[PDB]
Structure formats: C-alpha cells, structure tokens
C-alpha cells in the first residue's frame, strides 16, 4: 500500500491534520494506512477512521441521490430521451461508492473485528459493518440485494446483542448503533414499525439512565438522543 512506508504515528498525525483541512479522502487514506499496520486501534483512532470514511461516502451518497433523481425523472412519461449519459454517470458514482464501502468492509474483515475483544471496540466495528452494508443496500438492485440487506441486519444484530449485555443504555456508541439500526429498519428493510419501536425504546432507556452521568457524558448522550427524537418526529 502507498502508506506502507509511513510511520503509524505519522499517519495518525496526518489524519488529524487532514480532518482540520476538511481533506477527508486524504484522511481516509491515512487511516487505512494506519489500520494496515496491523495493530489494534484506540478509541480516538476508531473515531478518526469512522469520521474519515463517513465523510467520503457521505459525499458519494449525496451525489448518487442527485443523479438517481435525475435518472428517475428521465424515465417518467413525456420525458425527452437524452441518451445513456445520466445512467452512465450515475453508474460511475455508484461504482466508486461501492468501492469505498468494499474498502471499509475489507479493513473490518482484515482484521479489525477479529482482534476486537472489548465490548466497546467490537460493537463499534460491527456497527460500522452494518453501516457500510447499509450504504451498499441503498444502491443495490440485483440478485445480491437481499444478501446485502441481510449482511447489514446480521452485523447490526450482533452489535446490538453485545451492546445490550455490556454497555449502559446511555453509551454514545450503543445509542448511535440503535439510531442507525432504526434507520436501517425504516429506509432499507421496509419495517417502519420496527424502526419506530427501536427508536422509542432506545430513547426511553437512555432517559432513565441519564441521572448516572457527569455533565460531559450527559451532553454526549443527549446529543444522540436528540437524533432519535428527530427521527421519531419525522416518522410519527
């Protein structure tokens, strides 16, 4: 890999500089290089890895949605035929998005999840696995679509089982996992009732645990609880 010659610590240092510069593609390449050193990631390093790829794929997803919308309008009645360019360019962005998701899933499988023994790291990586299969599912249309969806569901479910056993209901990663699994149910699995039930129960169990938290932990947890509430407001 192109980062093979750079020190692990220098890659982490440069990932933080890239974040400050909003250079998220660089940030992701630096963090991929750090993962490929083969050592486990600290909590801060896991967050850098996630932030980097979240921003890269987030831009790709936004572009794909713009192009898919244009493509859909081109297939409506009365729409003028414009040739293959819209489909071609949507496919270009789609293939690049799929490539990033495959890269992330590859890092999780080689060998971040295998070596993650603590609840916090294992849940973090399994949530990531669910997330990037969910992004693959957003664009899937072929005979692998059901398998992609089940891969997301399976990863989220394993993360949920560990998180419920080993983490408090206010833990921000537990909360973000539940938030994302609820979005998976609503947007991907055609299960809005399951999505709403999960968001409600997650919110209520966190509320009951806030009294145990310091001021700073309270702020971290309520930030994610507000996203659950925002979704419930959209959905009900």
């Amino acid at each position: 890999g192109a980062m093979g010659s750079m020190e692990r610590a220098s890659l982490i240092q440069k990932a933080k500089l890239a974040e400050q510069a909003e250079r998220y593609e660089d940030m992701a390449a630096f963090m991929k290089g750090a993962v490929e050193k083969g050592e486990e990631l600290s909590c801060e390093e896991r967050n850098l890895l996630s932030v980097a790829y979240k921003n890269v794929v987030g831009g790709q997803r936004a572009a794909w949605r713009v192009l898919s919308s244009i493509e859909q309008k081109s297939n409506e009645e009365g729409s003028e035929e414009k040739g293959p360019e819209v489909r071609e360019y949507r496919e270009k962005v789609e293939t690049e998005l799929q490539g990033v998701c495959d890269t992330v899933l590859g890092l999780l499988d080689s060998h971040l999840i295998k070596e993650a023994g603590d609840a916090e790291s294992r849940v973090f990586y399994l949530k990531m696995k669910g997330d990037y299969y969910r992004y693959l599912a957003e664009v899937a249309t072929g005979d692998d679509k059901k398998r992609i969806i089940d891969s997301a569901r399976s990863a989220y479910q394993e993360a949920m089982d560990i998180s419920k056993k080993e983490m408090p209901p206010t833990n921000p990663i537990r909360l973000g996992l539940a938030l994302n699994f609820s979005v998976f149910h609503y947007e991907i699995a055609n299960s809005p009732e399951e999505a709403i039930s999960l968001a409600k129960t997650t919110f209520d169990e966190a509320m009951a645990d806030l009294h145990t938290l310091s001021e700073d932990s309270y702020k971290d947890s309520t930030l994610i609880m507000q996203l659950l509430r925002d979704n419930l407001t959209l959905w009900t």
């Binding site: 936004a62 979005v183 979704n231």
Partner: peptide, 8 residues
C-alpha cells in the same frame, strides 16, 4: 438524506 444517522 431521508433520516438522521450517527455522527460516528
């Protein structure tokens, strides 16, 4: 985006 998801 259709819904809110986790910042990390």
């Amino acid at each position: 985006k259709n819904a809110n998801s986790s910042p990390v």
